[PDB]
Amino acid sequence: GDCKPCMHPDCRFNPGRCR
């Protein structure tokens, strides 16, 4: 990840952040 840290389940496609 880069924008929104992908250190949690939510970073599957962070809507508006890290896809």
Side-chain angles (χ1 to χ4, degrees):
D2 182 273
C3 28
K4 193 178 185 182
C6 191
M7 299 181 183
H8 53 124
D10 185 84
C11 64
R12 357 78 175 183
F13 76 129
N14 313 267
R17 297 286 68 209
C18 295
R19 310 180 69 181

